[PDB]
Structure formats: structure tokens, C-alpha cells
Write a protein that binds this ligand. Structure first.
Ligand SMILES: CCOC(=O)c1cn[nH]c1C(F)(F)F
Ligand SMILES: CCOC(=O)c1cn[nH]c1C(F)(F)F
Ligand SMILES: [Mn+2]
Ligand SMILES: [Mn+2]
Lengths: 137, 137
């Protein structure tokens, strides 16, 4: 069967600023780069940045809710979010509808998130403050 | 410091067919559903389906290369690809890279992939045959 995400590939319009964002600003590990892409890791996540002439820099009001959340500890969350804010990283959402999260944009408008907590923790929180019509299996 | 992918959220235009696709066709575990979304798991992956009227059913020629690859063993790959083919799931690309890959579309046109092989396997292959302009770190 399927077991886990093998990799996440993000199309990027300009490779160098995107590599810098994920490696320098977000602290991911850069393993390789080439004329048309880069491979990074974030813990056990394999991230590929793929230079794509079709990628457009997309304002958040023009894209749907598809988004990518990265895990961060409760101890590190607030200072990392504040550092992104002070660095001028654009945002896309403010209301915490799914727990402790910070919503921010990459250089091409990919919708990213810092989140504290696992799926198990989110299900437990939802039992007390469920979403409308929620059923648990 | 970021420790991995916390969750992947896909915006969907119709919740019921998307739940059917990810749970029944792709075999992911459904943990909860509410009027506007669902939580599933696939190995370590936390997947959220979020009902979003802004989601367009998007032909693959009209979206960029951003895509989501799921892990499967080599031994299971061919029968899973055949299951998708029997279900009429469209393919958006042929494999031309190392490691088995099957490139398929979800009901809204999200670009998915089945892939066999890790980042370490890819890096080893690239060291032997580097892409144009490739540098390692
Ligand atoms: C850590 C300094 O970097 C930034 O503030 C920033 C903001 N957007 N991209 C960056 C980058 F690429 F330099 F990492
Ligand atoms: C793709 C090889 O280039 C690199 O790894 C790299 C890293 N900083 N700058 C480069 C450059 F200029 F070659 F694009
Ligand atoms: Mn989220
Ligand atoms: Mn891929």
C-alpha cells in the first residue's frame, strides 16, 4: 500500500531566491542544486524545488486553500514566526482555525504554515472544540 | 527549527468524491470528517482535504509542476498502478527518471505520483550521473 509522502515538489519561478528562502530563511538542509532545481530535506521530508517557466508568482487571494505545513516545537514556534514577520515575509491567514499555526507565503506565493502539534493532538482538541458536523472514526 | 512536514492540505471542490479517492481508491485511513473537510493519514503523512469553492477542476496543461509523491514498495508498484488504470485515473506524465514513478491526477487535478526510492537513492544516482550544473553540499 501507500506509506507516507515520498517527496514534495514545488514549482519555482526563480531558483536562487527559492533555494535561499528554504535553506537560509527556513533552515532546511540543502543537499544538491543544478541548473533547473534543488534537493533539500527538512527532517524526514524530501523537498524538491523545480524551476518551471509556467510557475507564476501568485497572490494568496488568487489561489485556493492548498497548503504545506512544517512542524515546529512549542518552544521555538513564536520566535520563528516573529523572525519571519520581521524579515518581511508575507502572510495569507491570521485566524487560528486549526490550532497553533503561523501562515506565510514563499517567494512564488506557495502557501506555507508553521504548526505545533500532531494529528492525534488535533483530533483530541477537535473533540472539545469540533468543526461543524464533525464525526470521528 | 523545522522538524518535518506537519501536514499536507489539498483544497477540493467536492468533498465526497475526494474522500472516496483518497480513502477507498488510494487506501488512506479516514480519521474524521466534518461539513467542510476531512483528516486522513497515509503512513506518517497527515492529509487534510478542505472543501473550497475556489478550487477549480484544473487540467494538467493549466497547472505548474508542483506535485505530491507517495511512497510505495517496488513489489507493490505495478498492481497499484493497474488499480488506478482500472479506475480510469488519468496520467499526466511518463516516467523518465530513476526509480519507478506513476504520475496521476486527483479528481480536482492535483498532480500526484507513486514513487519507489528515497532521497539517498536519488543523490547516489546523481553523483554517478550529475544533472547539468549539479553541485553537491
Ligand atoms: C534570513 C534572511 O532572509 C530573509 O529574510 C529572506 C526573506 N525572503 N527570503 C529570504 C532569504 F532568501 F534571504 F533567505
Ligand atoms: C547549481 C550550481 O550552483 C550552485 O550550487 C550555487 C550556489 N550558490 N550559487 C550557485 C550558482 F551560482 F552556481 F548558481
Ligand atoms: Mn494547515
Ligand atoms: Mn516527483
Amino acid at each position: 500500500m501507500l506509506s507516507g509522502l515520498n517527496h514534495l515538489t514545488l514549482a519555482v519561478s526563480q531558483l536562487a531566491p527559492s533555494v535561499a528562502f528554504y535553506q537560509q530563511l527556513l533552515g532546511m538542509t540543502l543537499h544538491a542544486r543544478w541548473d533547473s532545481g534543488a534537493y533539500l530535506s527538512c527532517g524526514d521530508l524530501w523537498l524538491c524545488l523545480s524551476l518551471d517557466p509556467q510557475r507564476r508568482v501568485t497572490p494568496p487571494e488568487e489561489s485556493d486553500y492548498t497548503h504545506y505545513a512544517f512542524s515546529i516545537s512549542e518552544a521555538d514556534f513564536a520566535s520563528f514566526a516573529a523572525r519571519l514577520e520581521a524579515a518581511g515575509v508575507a502572510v495569507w491567514k491570521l485566524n487560528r482555525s486549526e490550532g497553533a499555526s503561523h501562515y506565510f507565503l514563499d517567494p512564488d506565493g506557495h502557501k506555507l504554515e508553521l504548526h505545533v502539534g500532531s494529528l492525534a493532538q488535533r483530533l483530541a482538541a477537535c473533540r472539545e472544540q469540533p468543526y461543524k458536523g464533525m464525526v470521528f472514526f
